[PDB]
Amino acid sequence: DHHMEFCRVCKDGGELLCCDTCPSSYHIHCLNPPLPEIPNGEWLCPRCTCPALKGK
Amino acid sequence: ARTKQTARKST
Ligand SMILES: [Zn+2]
Ligand SMILES: [Zn+2]
């Protein structure tokens, strides 16, 4: 596998949402909008979901 | 969206 073996939030290795763009691992409830189940399609972690790079 | 299941802190 190519992402963390536990939720970056909990350090718990439950069902971890494999960020489609990066090796970040989270529980669907350790996100901003908690999910009742793993999303359909391209899911990105909070780290990847920032469109505006705050260079300043 | 993908998911892994490894070592969650149940034990
Ligand atoms: Zn978690
Ligand atoms: Zn990511």
Side-chain angles (χ1 to χ4, degrees):
Chain A
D1 171 68
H2 189 251
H3 74 318
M4 302 222 309
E5 61 196 319
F6 45 92
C7 169
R8 181 182 176 133
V9 185
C10 303
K11 305 289 178 66
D12 173 284
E15 197 168 12
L16 320 163
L17 204 26
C18 189
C19 187
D20 185 85
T21 51
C22 89
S24 298
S25 312
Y26 279 65
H27 295 128
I28 47 184
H29 276 223
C30 314
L31 296 176
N32 295 269
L35 292 136
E37 194 188 67
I38 319 312
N40 186 332
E42 191 183 281
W43 178 88
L44 287 333
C45 74
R47 204 68 279 143
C48 290
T49 50
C50 55
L53 185 61
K54 201 59 163 53
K56 295 184 61 176
Chain B
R2 193 188 173 189
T3 14
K4 186 161 65 181
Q5 293 208 329
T6 164
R8 49 280 194 230
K9 283 150 148 59
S10 306
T11 41

